[PDB]
Amino acid sequence: WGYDDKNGPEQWSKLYPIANGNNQSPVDIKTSETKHDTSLKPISVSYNPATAKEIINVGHSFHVNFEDNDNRSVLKGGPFSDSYRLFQFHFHWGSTNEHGSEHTVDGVKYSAELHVAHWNSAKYSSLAEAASKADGLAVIGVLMKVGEANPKLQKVLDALQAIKTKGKRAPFTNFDPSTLLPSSLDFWTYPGSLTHPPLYESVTWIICKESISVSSEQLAQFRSLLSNVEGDNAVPMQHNNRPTQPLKGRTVRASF
Amino acid sequence: DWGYDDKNGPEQWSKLYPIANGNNQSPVDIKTSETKHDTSLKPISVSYNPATAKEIINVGHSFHVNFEDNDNRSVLKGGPFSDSYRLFQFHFHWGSTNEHGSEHTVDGVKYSAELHVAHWNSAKYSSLAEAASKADGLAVIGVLMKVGEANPKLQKVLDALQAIKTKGKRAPFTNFDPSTLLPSSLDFWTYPGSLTHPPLYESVTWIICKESISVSSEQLAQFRSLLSNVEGDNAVPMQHNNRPTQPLKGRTVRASF
Ligand SMILES: [O][B]1([O])O[C][C]C2=[C][C]=[C][C]=C21
Numbered sequence: 285w286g287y288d289d290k291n292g293p294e295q296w297s298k299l300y301p302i303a304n305g306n307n308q309s310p311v312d313i314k315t316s317e318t319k320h321d322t323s324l325k326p327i328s329v330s331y332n333p334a335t336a337k338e339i340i341n342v343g344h345s346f347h348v349n350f351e352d353n354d355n356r357s358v359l360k361g362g363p364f365s366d367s368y369r370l371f372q373f374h375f376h377w378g379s380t381n382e383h384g385s386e387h388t389v390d391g392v393k394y395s396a397e398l399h400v401a402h403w404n405s406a407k408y409s410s411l412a413e414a415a416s417k418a419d420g421l422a423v424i425g426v427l428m429k430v431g432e433a434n435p436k437l438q439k440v441l442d443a444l445q446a447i448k449t450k451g452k453r454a455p456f457t458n459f460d461p462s463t464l465l466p467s468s469l470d471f472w473t474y475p476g477s478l479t480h481p482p483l484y485e486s487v488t489w490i491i492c493k494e495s496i497s498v499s500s501e502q503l504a505q506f507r508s509l510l511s512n513v514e515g516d517n518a519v520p521m522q523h524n525n526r527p528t529q530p531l532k533g534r535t536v537r538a539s540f
Numbered sequence: 541d542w543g544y545d546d547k548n549g550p551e552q553w554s555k556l557y558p559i560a561n562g563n564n565q566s567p568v569d570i571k572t573s574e575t576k577h578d579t580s581l582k583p584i585s586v587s588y589n590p591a592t593a594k595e596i597i598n599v600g601h602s603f604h605v606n607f608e609d610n611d612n613r614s615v616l617k618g619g620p621f622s623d624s625y626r627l628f629q630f631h632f633h634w635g636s637t638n639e640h641g642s643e644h645t646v647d648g649v650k651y652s653a654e655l656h657v658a659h660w661n662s663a664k665y666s667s668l669a670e671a672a673s674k675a676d677g678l679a680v681i682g683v684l685m686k687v688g689e690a691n692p693k694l695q696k697v698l699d700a701l702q703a704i705k706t707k708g709k710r711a712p713f714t715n716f717d718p719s720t721l722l723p724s725s726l727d728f729w730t731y732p733g734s735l736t737h738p739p740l741y742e743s744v745t746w747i748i749c750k751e752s753i754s755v756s757s758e759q760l761a762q763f764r765s766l767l768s769n770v771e772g773d774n775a776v777p778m779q780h781n782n783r784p785t786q787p788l789k790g791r792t793v794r795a796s797f
């Protein structure tokens with residue numbers, strides 16, 4: 285699977301029939317159809333920068349992984365009773381500034397999207413166990429709007445020259461990704477899925493109402509990553525965003 | 541104005557620069573069966589002062605490394621020249637794939653990239669501006685670059701590119717001797733030709749090295765990740781900047797070897 289014409293989102297259903305499921309992500313958030321929910325607590329993130337481990341080129345994207353052996357780095361509050369343990373963050377982007385986000389708001393496409401992903405360590409003992417469970421994953425999505433350079437992205441962008449080609453990985457330490465989140469954590473939540481294979485319907489989404497910035501040139505740094513292995517013909521990672529999927533009667537709730 | 545796109549690319553240059561259809565246009569294919577050995581060709585000697593290195597700049601279609609050219613600290617002599625020529629710049633050309641990015645070809649074989657090391661005649665002229673339109677004004681060493689092992693001599697140049705990502709950005713670039721980029725052997729071909737992009741002046745004595753240098757697939761990708769756009773506009777990678785070979789129109793390619 286990938287994002288090419290032949291292996292791309294429109295074709296994922298042949299290998300992963302859940303792609304046509306009732307809880308697929310991302311979605312278009314229509315603000316006229318959201319339900320304000322008075323029981324939603326504020327989101328609480330508490331991340332320890334010592335849990336930052338490694339950055340990896342996974343061919344379609346890059347991942348920044350965290351040590352997830354204990355509760356040093358946790359998400360709480362919002363719609364959750366359980367504590368969720370941070371394991372990774374990554375981005376999605378598009379071939380031009382016009383699109384690149386996965387979630388849209390009232391049909392508006394942003395230039396990129398940050399996913400901060402967590403697993404339910406109250407109910408499950410590993411990511412592997414949690415990743416297929418309806419209540420297994422909690423993911424913060426942050427819409428990235430093209431504009432001013434975002435200096436919080438700096439350590440991340442500076443690391444990419446060490447993982448230019450598929451499979452390269454390097455230590456990535458002493459970093460607290462709550463520094464990438466917007467000032468307001470007002471949010472939408474809905475029950476959904478991973479946005480690429482295996483597309484498990486295991487994600488409670490937390491979509492920030494406030495965007496964060498990214499420059500045209502910062503997005504070019506993402507797009508200059510290579511999907512090919514070292515020594516092969518360079519194939520830039522031009523995009524990795526999935527189109528929005530049908531709500532199929534799910535309700536998007538607002539904290540605000 | 542002019543570029544390497546279908547709209548404004550080399551096949552369209554003759555509209556704005558009629559000399560593009562001239563008798564001394566570059567690059568050319570070197571057919572080794574038709575080269576003539578000329579006993580009058582001395583060895584090339586380059587003596588470059590690494591304190592003449594000045595600035596690296598994104599020029600929209602390419603990037604240039606510029607040298608102070610106020611005196612003759614950094615000079616090319618020998619080969620077909622009586623005069624010393626003063627170093628002013630080096631730059632590269634590359635292609636959209638590893639299969640064809642050089643400008644000059646040898647027996648029809650296209651290399652992955654090409655280095656140009658450019659010099660102006662400071663014996664006869666007082667400035668680059670004066671020298672540039674003159675038949676005897678410029679001397680340019682071309683080196684063919686063959687995709688394979690990473691070339692560590694390219695390191696300081698490729699490390700500098702993050703400071704000049706968009707059109708018009710520039711940064712200091714100091715203490716560099718570009719003779720470190722040349723092959724070990726300086727056996728060469730020479731022919732009278734032109735600048736390979738506008739304004740296409742027929743002012744260049746070409747020195748094409750017989751020996752190639754290395755470059756990796758990832759090093760070429762670093763060139764292609766430079767942006768042709770100005771800061772703040774949608775990123776447009778510099779995918780290629782190599783002109784096709786032009787007719788010899790009776791010129792002779794002479795061999796030093
Ligand atoms: O974009 B993704 O497929 O859905 C969001 C959650 C997640 C977590 C880790 C890797 C990938 C994904």
Ligand SMILES: [O][B]1([O])O[C][C]C2=[C][C]=[C][C]=C21
Nearest residue numbers: 629656658680734735736737
């Ligand atoms: O590729 B070019 O147009 O012909 C080579 C010589 C030269 C020198 C400086 C800038 C450009 C060029």
Ligand code: NA
Nearest residue numbers: 581582796797
């Ligand atoms: Na000789």
Ligand SMILES: [Zn+2]
Nearest residue numbers: 374376399479
């Ligand atoms: Zn994601």
Ligand SMILES: [Zn+2]
Nearest residue numbers: 631633656736
């Ligand atoms: Zn050139």
